[PDB]
Design a protein around this motif. Structure first.
Motif, mmCIF file in Angstrom:
data_model
loop_
_atom_site.group_PDB
_atom_site.id
_atom_site.type_symbol
_atom_site.label_atom_id
_atom_site.label_comp_id
_atom_site.label_asym_id
_atom_site.label_seq_id
_atom_site.Cartn_x
_atom_site.Cartn_y
_atom_site.Cartn_z
ATOM 1 N N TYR B 67 -5.837 -8.766 -2.886
ATOM 2 C CA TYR B 67 -4.460 -9.189 -3.007
ATOM 3 C C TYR B 67 -3.841 -9.295 -1.616
ATOM 4 O O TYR B 67 -4.094 -8.450 -0.760
ATOM 5 C CB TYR B 67 -3.681 -8.187 -3.850
ATOM 6 N N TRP B 81 -0.084 -5.337 7.230
ATOM 7 C CA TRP B 81 -1.013 -4.735 6.280
ATOM 8 C C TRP B 81 -1.962 -5.726 5.591
ATOM 9 O O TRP B 81 -2.915 -5.310 4.969
ATOM 10 C CB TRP B 81 -0.247 -3.907 5.255
ATOM 11 N N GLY B 114 -6.438 2.848 3.707
ATOM 12 C CA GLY B 114 -5.772 2.885 2.401
ATOM 13 C C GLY B 114 -5.460 1.501 1.854
ATOM 14 O O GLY B 114 -6.123 0.514 2.187
ATOM 15 N N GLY B 115 -4.430 1.433 1.017
ATOM 16 C CA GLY B 115 -4.078 0.203 0.309
ATOM 17 C C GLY B 115 -4.287 0.292 -1.190
ATOM 18 O O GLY B 115 -4.603 -0.712 -1.824
ATOM 19 N N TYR B 118 -6.668 -1.360 -4.016
ATOM 20 C CA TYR B 118 -6.604 -2.819 -4.287
ATOM 21 C C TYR B 118 -6.570 -3.680 -3.013
ATOM 22 O O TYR B 118 -6.659 -4.899 -3.095
ATOM 23 C CB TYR B 118 -5.380 -3.177 -5.169
ATOM 24 N N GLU B 196 -5.692 7.522 5.147
ATOM 25 C CA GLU B 196 -4.303 7.547 4.699
ATOM 26 C C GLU B 196 -4.167 6.875 3.342
ATOM 27 O O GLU B 196 -4.842 5.877 3.077
ATOM 28 C CB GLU B 196 -3.425 6.846 5.723
ATOM 29 N N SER B 197 -3.298 7.423 2.489
ATOM 30 C CA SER B 197 -2.977 6.820 1.184
ATOM 31 C C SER B 197 -4.234 6.931 0.322
ATOM 32 O O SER B 197 -4.697 8.044 0.080
ATOM 33 C CB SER B 197 -2.448 5.370 1.335
ATOM 34 N N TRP B 276 -3.060 -7.562 -11.966
ATOM 35 C CA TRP B 276 -1.899 -6.747 -12.358
ATOM 36 C C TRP B 276 -1.509 -6.953 -13.804
ATOM 37 O O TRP B 276 -0.650 -6.243 -14.320
ATOM 38 C CB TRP B 276 -0.694 -7.053 -11.456
ATOM 39 N N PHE B 327 8.616 2.230 -0.127
ATOM 40 C CA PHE B 327 7.862 0.983 -0.272
ATOM 41 C C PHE B 327 7.745 0.474 -1.705
ATOM 42 O O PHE B 327 7.876 -0.720 -1.965
ATOM 43 C CB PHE B 327 6.433 1.159 0.246
ATOM 44 N N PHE B 328 7.480 1.381 -2.633
ATOM 45 C CA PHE B 328 7.125 0.998 -3.994
ATOM 46 C C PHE B 328 8.357 0.670 -4.789
ATOM 47 O O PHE B 328 8.293 -0.103 -5.732
ATOM 48 C CB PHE B 328 6.302 2.100 -4.658
ATOM 49 N N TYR B 331 9.373 -3.049 -3.647
ATOM 50 C CA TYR B 331 8.565 -4.081 -4.292
ATOM 51 C C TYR B 331 8.713 -4.161 -5.811
ATOM 52 O O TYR B 331 8.618 -5.252 -6.375
ATOM 53 C CB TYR B 331 7.089 -3.900 -3.928
ATOM 54 N N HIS B 437 5.849 5.364 4.077
ATOM 55 C CA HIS B 437 4.436 5.497 3.732
ATOM 56 C C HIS B 437 3.609 4.599 4.654
ATOM 57 O O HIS B 437 3.759 3.378 4.638
ATOM 58 C CB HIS B 437 4.287 5.084 2.260
ATOM 59 N N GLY B 438 2.778 5.213 5.491
ATOM 60 C CA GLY B 438 1.905 4.477 6.397
ATOM 61 C C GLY B 438 2.324 4.408 7.856
ATOM 62 O O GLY B 438 1.582 3.888 8.686
HETATM 63 C C1 LIG Z 1 0.215 2.031 4.380
HETATM 64 N N1 LIG Z 1 -0.177 0.942 3.464
HETATM 65 C C2 LIG Z 1 -1.137 -0.156 3.895
HETATM 66 C C3 LIG Z 1 -1.315 1.768 2.931
HETATM 67 C C4 LIG Z 1 0.459 0.833 2.145
HETATM 68 C C5 LIG Z 1 1.761 0.060 2.316
HETATM 69 C C6 LIG Z 1 1.499 -1.436 2.427
HETATM 70 C C7 LIG Z 1 2.597 -2.263 1.762
HETATM 71 C C8 LIG Z 1 2.438 -2.360 0.246
HETATM 72 C C9 LIG Z 1 3.307 -1.336 -0.474
HETATM 73 C C10 LIG Z 1 4.025 -1.921 -1.677
HETATM 74 C C11 LIG Z 1 3.208 -1.783 -2.956
HETATM 75 C C12 LIG Z 1 2.955 -3.155 -3.556
HETATM 76 C C13 LIG Z 1 2.534 -3.034 -5.009
HETATM 77 N N2 LIG Z 1 1.617 -4.116 -5.437
HETATM 78 C C14 LIG Z 1 1.310 -5.319 -4.632
HETATM 79 C C15 LIG Z 1 0.874 -3.890 -6.692
HETATM 80 C C16 LIG Z 1 2.713 -4.854 -6.164
#
Ligand SMILES: C[N+](C)(C)CCCCCCCCCC[N+](C)(C)C
Ligand SMILES: *[C@@H]1O[C@H](CO)[C@@H](O[C@@H]2O[C@H](CO)[C@@H](O[C@@H]3O[C@H](CO)[C@@H](O)[C@H](O[C@H]4O[C@H](CO)[C@@H](O)[C@H](O)[C@@H]4O[C@H]4O[C@H](CO)[C@@H](O)[C@H](O)[C@@H]4O)[C@@H]3O)[C@H](O)[C@H]2NC(C)=O)[C@H](O)[C@H]1NC(C)=O
Ligand SMILES: *[C@@H]1O[C@H](CO)[C@@H](O[C@@H]2O[C@H](CO)[C@@H](O[C@@H]3O[C@H](CO)[C@@H](O)[C@H](O[C@H]4O[C@H](CO)[C@@H](O)[C@H](O)[C@@H]4O[C@H]4O[C@H](CO)[C@@H](O)[C@H](O)[C@@H]4O)[C@@H]3O)[C@H](O)[C@H]2NC(C)=O)[C@H](O)[C@H]1NC(C)=O
Ligand SMILES: C[N+](C)(C)CCCCCCCCCC[N+](C)(C)C
Ligand SMILES: *[C@@H]1O[C@H](CO)[C@@H](O)[C@H](O)[C@H]1NC(C)=O
Ligand SMILES: *[C@@H]1O[C@H](CO)[C@@H](O)[C@H](O)[C@H]1NC(C)=O
Ligand SMILES: *[C@@H]1O[C@H](CO)[C@@H](O)[C@H](O)[C@H]1NC(C)=O
Ligand SMILES: *[C@@H]1O[C@H](CO)[C@@H](O)[C@H](O)[C@H]1NC(C)=O
Lengths: 532, 532
Positions: B67, B81, B114-115, B118, B196-197, B276, B327-328, B331, B437-438
């Motif tokens: 993705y 990222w 991490g990531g 996915y 990480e993560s 998803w 972050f979450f 999004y 986060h990250g």
């Molecule tokens: C530090 N890292 C690289 C590890 C994680 C943060 C990278 C940005 C993505 C976070 C938002 C989650 C998106 C959810 N998905 C795309 C499922 C919608």
């Protein structure tokens, strides 16, 4: 004559009593009902048969039969709450303090004592109405009512022990005031009932109960509300306890007739001896014989009456003390004692919440524990002590009253809410117990005005402010003076939820009294216990 | 030659790379496995067939199919990222940064990206190991592993799609390091895995998994742990998702053979397009294809392995960021956006907790809400925003890691715990998202050392302290220098539970990181959801 008053029940002769180097009139021990003796134990009160001749109302009447605290013999802190007269089933009397000269029609305040529906007296030193009557120019009445099994044994379905007769006792006193207070210079159109603890709960029950509503104009509730978990039981729970009491006295249980007959043959003290054997749980702040939700006195459940606005719409003034729980922990919870700091181990904490929330499954106990534990410290004996104290006060007094306030206020015509948090400088109980359940009462009755009783000057001033709020509220439905340079005690509104601290410092106005915890006790925990 | 290294897989040719006005060696894109293509999609990795001739390891390899975030086109905050190379199923390569001159046997650190299982790449700018290798005189490896369906589709019972093959990819990289890092001057006896993560969760999975334990000495976990609720699923849940994926691509579902055959015929992007659609709830911080608790890779459930001490006993160093959730929410949660303060209405709050705790019944949602709402304010959009942010971080990252820490520490040989709470002065994301986060990663890899990247001087100093803690810990199992006038980062003990803040201010030592909330998430809420 000024000590001679002619009533619908007959003539009454009072005494002249000294008050702060002045005088007022006092009519002590006037009967408002027939003596509930013999055949009449557990029955509804009968109105007092009119008498000819003059009733001597110059001394206090007897107190109702009741449990006597003997944990601390000679200790004034405990013994100030015991009967100071001979105990008798012949106890349905009221006392009236009247200004001199006699007014034509002034504000009337009727005091309803507490004591968990198992104890209480109209005649206690702290309840002497003379200071208040004199200082605020009001007619002060204190009634009495049967307590314990004598006032609240409830075999619903019978007329020999219907339940709630102690509440009917109260109503009959109120009926008598309605009918006869005019002859003492009282205004029957302006009578304010006020009480503390179970008396505060009783006041709220008279607000709810359709048969009591027409007999007073306004109400004050102190550290007590009708929906408190200790203040009432269902008809089946009352029946179980009635039977279980009879089981403890080796009574015949084939029928209600044979049970009540047997409980009537017993000497009063025999019933009092086993009163606490009938509680179905290991608990604190729970009492054996209390009001029943019967269908007569309360048409439906307390909660649906509050929700639907089925209550007297008027002005109320009410509040709570900082540390309502501490008394009940001292008497009933391991780890606490009168003569230590009472630092509480983790085990006495867990034991304490069990005692405090007796219907709670393990998940319910974990929920309370989570809510009241500081997890940074966790093993600190003071924090455990204080946490536990807050649990008992919040669950049994503060959060039920806040539920009542918020529900009354949607339909009422004025709410004033206080939080009393002054620790008296002459208090006899240990510091850990804080601002104790019942110790605002002495300020409401003006004991800080008498020199011999060792209060501070700023405590005299606090009591004068409190007597003035109370009396003015009785008088007009607002504790504030129209003009007055002093800061206003604002209305409690649904939107802003304002209340005041009642202490020696200049008045601070706060909002949303203990909401975090009261969302826990009034919304979350019931939902949790119902879902399991 | 110094860029020429002879390994058990064959000869390898690296490049000389500039670092802070000096040089080091880099061996980029060395294969450690056979390409998982065609028949081999979803299968275990095969070891790389030895090659004759020289493998050109002068440029980064391809990234694994995955993705790609396109919410904010051109925005470096998001695009830092994404894959910066061509995507390919042919992606099992590792990269090695080696000091110049070549050491004889120094500390080795193996980075696992991490990531969310996915996404992720070994080749990102932030993961360039050259700064760390040079500054701390260590051999830095970064591996890669298949992500998404390609690495974690799990039809347990089959060998064609067993599950966990992305974790086996990682192990094969580790096996390769164990076997060949000596030829680069690395010490195979002193290799520290860190991630990480999901990489942090992966590190903890290698600690747990008996087949991975012998391949490294020590571990660092950043904002991730194996017992995180997003990090794994049961075999039946994996099977449902596998089938549901096939349902989305109109595949034949009569059998595992016919499903896997069909999923192999699909072009990679076709699988990524519907990844998803297979999540069974409306959620955030949950990912479709993650490790399965299969019985092979993990002998039993994660929790019983932690309880019984069934794991590699060594030293661990780990920690979390102040604002893991933000972050979450950005999004996936209504009300939040990149270019506003994102004040959250009461409705977006309630919507947000649903999303955050997807298995929770109504009582579970009330419990979270009660725990994270300030009832004095209640409608404040900032407090709702921050409360929600804390819910997502605490539930998904902080409290699982604290459970892991407390359980590892009973049987381990040394824990060091950190809380990273510095907001970078050059951060591109809005202030509301806090310490994201990250974003400790850039400090761990030394980007604050490069002038062109616009960090402060005190940020350079923070990164140097962090690189030194990390490398020293890799080296000895203690992040502290034996002498050193600087204050000690103490051990995390069961009794005292000490950790440190990792920021630009002089080191403060704290205790019991977020216990109040972690008692809620780790003890109370599960018990509540199980009892209902
Ligand atoms: C530090 N890292 C690289 C590890 C994680 C943060 C990278 C940005 C993505 C976070 C938002 C989650 C998106 C959810 N998905 C795309 C499922 C919608
Ligand atoms: C206002 O403030 C003042 C000052 O603080 C308070 O005055 C003090 O009051 C107490 C009593 O309330 C008084 O203490 C008594 O002093 C007496 C003389 O020294 C003692 O004889 C007496 O001891 C007896 O009672 C005790 C129980 O409290 C027992 O411990 C002791 O053994 C004694 O018991 C005797 O009792 C029986 C029956 O009388 C007898 O046969 C036996 O001999 C037996 O031994 C008390 O200790 C203080 O001295 C007072 N202090 C001052 C300065 O006056 C006052 O109480 C406050 N007022 C209010 C209303 O609170
Ligand atoms: C370290 O700090 C410094 C200072 O803060 C940072 O330097 C700034 O960097 C930005 C770009 O990253 C730069 O902004 C550009 O300025 C150019 C000249 O004025 C503009 O031409 C350019 O605009 C284009 O890009 C924008 C997208 O960001 C668009 O909004 C805009 O429409 C333009 O888009 C054009 O793109 C295509 C392709 O090129 C072209 O065909 C079209 O014309 C189209 O219009 C940017 O605004 C700042 O001026 C820099 N400031 C200084 C003082 O140098 C630096 O980024 C920091 N370094 C790091 C690593 O963070
Ligand atoms: C202000 N008053 C008068 C209302 C109540 C406090 C009076 C002291 C009694 C409190 C302790 C409870 C005892 C419990 N019982 C005896 C059942 C054990
Ligand atoms: C009333 O009773 C008191 C005390 O019991 C007594 O002293 C008094 O004489 C009585 N009053 C009258 C009018 O008889
Ligand atoms: C109470 O009632 C009066 C008269 O009916 C009304 O005008 C007044 O606004 C009311 N006050 C409150 C606080 O409800
Ligand atoms: C390795 O690849 C690079 C770039 O693809 C190329 O420039 C270089 O010549 C190659 N090295 C050797 C030894 O052929
Ligand atoms: C770890 O192991 C060593 C050697 O076995 C032991 O002596 C030491 O005390 C241990 N340290 C900790 C923190 O457990």
């Amino acid at each position: 004559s000024e000590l001679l008053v002619n009533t619908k029940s007959g003539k009454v002769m009072g005494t002249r009593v000294p008050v702060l180097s002045s005088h007022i009139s006092a009519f002590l021990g006037i009967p408002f009902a027939e003596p509930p003796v013999g055949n009449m134990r557990f029955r509804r009160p009968e109105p007092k048969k009119p008498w000819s001749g003059v009733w001597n109302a110059s001394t206090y009447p007897n107190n109702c039969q009741q449990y006597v605290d003997e944990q601390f013999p000679g200790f004034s802190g405990s013994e100030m709450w015991n009967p100071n007269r001979e105990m008798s089933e012949d106890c349905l009397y009221l006392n009236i303090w009247v200004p001199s000269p006699r007014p034509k029609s002034t504000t009337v305040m009727v005091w309803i004592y507490g004591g968990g529906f198992y104890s209480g007296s109209s005649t206690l030193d702290v309840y002497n109405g003379k200071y208040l009557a004199y200082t605020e120019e009001v007619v002060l009445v204190s009634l009495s009512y049967r307590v314990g099994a004598f006032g609240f044994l409830a075999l619903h379905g019978s007329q020999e022990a219907p339940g709630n007769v102690g509440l009917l006792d109260q109503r009959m006193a109120l009926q008598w005031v309605h009918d006869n207070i005019q002859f003492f210079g009282g205004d029957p159109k302006t009578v304010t009932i006020f009480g503390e603890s179970a008396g505060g709960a009783s006041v709220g029950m008279h607000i709810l109960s359709p048969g009591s509503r027409d007999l007073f104009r306004r109400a004050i509730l102190q550290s007590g509300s009708p929906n408190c978990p200790w203040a009432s039981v269902s008809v089946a729970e009352g029946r179980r306890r009635a039977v279980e009491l009879g089981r403890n006295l080796n009574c015949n249980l084939n029928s209600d007739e044979e049970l009540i007959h047997c409980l009537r043959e017993k000497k009063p003290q025999e019933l009092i001896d086993v009163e606490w054997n009938v509680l179905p749980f290991d608990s604190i702040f729970r009492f054996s014989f209390v009001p029943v939700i019967d269908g007569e006195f309360f048409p439906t459940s307390l909660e649906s009456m509050l929700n639907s606005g089925n209550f007297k719409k008027t002005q109320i003034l009410l509040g709570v003390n900082k540390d309502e729980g501490s008394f009940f922990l001292l008497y009933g919870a391991p780890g606490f004692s009168k003569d230590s700091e009472s630092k509480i181990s983790r085990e006495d904490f867990m034991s304490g919440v069990k005692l405090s929330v007796p219907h709670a499954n393990d998940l319910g106990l974990d929920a309370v524990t989570l809510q009241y534990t500081d997890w940074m410290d966790d093993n600190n004996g003071i924090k455990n002590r204080d946490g536990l104290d807050d649990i008992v006060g919040d669950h049994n007094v503060i959060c039920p009253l806040m539920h009542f306030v918020n529900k009354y206020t949607k339909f009422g015509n004025g709410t004033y809410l206080y939080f009393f948090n002054h620790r008296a400088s002459n208090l006899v109980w240990p510091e850990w117990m804080g601002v104790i359940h019942g110790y605002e009462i002495e300020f409401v009755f003006g004991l800080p005005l008498v020199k011999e009783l060792n209060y501070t000057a700023e405590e005299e001033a606090l009591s004068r402010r409190i007597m003035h709020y109370w009396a003015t509220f009785a008088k007009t439905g607002n504790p504030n003076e129209p003009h007055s340079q002093e800061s206003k005690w604002p209305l409690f509104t649904t939107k802003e939820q304002k209340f005041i601290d009642l202490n020696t410092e200049p008045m601070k106005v706060h909002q949303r009294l203990r909401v975090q915890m009261c969302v826990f006790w009034n919304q979350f925990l019931p939902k949790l216990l119902n879902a399991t």
